[PDB]
C-alpha cells in the first residue's frame with residue numbers, strides 16, 4: 734500500500750540532533766551558527782550543551798517558523814532570511830568567528846554550485862580547522878569534493894531517523 738509522509742518532511746529525531754550538536758565546544762568562548770532551525774529540535778540540543786542563548790545565531794527563511802521560534806526560545810538570536818546570503822543575514826564579514834556551524838538547510842533544493850560557494854563562505858567565519866556539520870539523506874555527500882577548498886569526512890549514520898540520516902563534516906583545507 735501507499736506510504737504517507739514520503740521523503741524528509743517530519744522533524745529530525747532527538748538522537749540525530751544531539752549528535753550534530755556534539756561537535757560544539759561550549760568552552761571556546763565563541764558563538765554557534767545554526768542554519769534552518771525549523772521547529773527548533775536542533776536548537777534545543779545546541780542549548781543543552783550549555784551555550785548561552787544570546788550566543789546562538791540561527792538563520793530561518795520561513796517567517797512563520799521564525800515568529801514561533803522567537804516565542805519558544807527566548808534570548809536566541811534568530812534571523813529571518815536566506816542562509817545563502819550571509820552578507821544580508823550576518824553582515825559583511827569583519828572578524829566575527831563562530832565555534833562551529835550546524836546546518837539542516839535542504840542542500841538538494843539548491844544547485845551544487847550554490848552549495849559549494851556557501852560552504853566556502855561559511856568556512857571563512859570559523860577558525861581554521863573547525864567544522865560545518867550537515868544532515869542529508871542520500872548515499873553520498875550533498876556537497877561534492879573540492880580538495881583544494883575543504884576536506885569531507887563522514888561523521889555518523891542514524892538509522893532511527895525518518896528517513897535514515899547521514900551526517901557529514903567539512904573543514905578548511
Ligand SMILES: Nc1ncnc2c1ncn2[C@@H]1O[C@H](CSCC[C@H](N)C(=O)O)[C@@H](O)[C@H]1O
Pocket residue numbers: 743744745768769770771772773774775792793794795798814815816817837838839
Ligand atoms: N536558504 C535557507 N535559509 C534559511 N533557512 C532555510 C533555507 N532553506 C530552507 N530553510 C529552512 O530550513 C529548514 C529545513 S528542514 C529542518 C528543520 C529542523 N532543523 C529539523 O532538523 O527538523 C526549514 O525550516 C526551512 O524553512
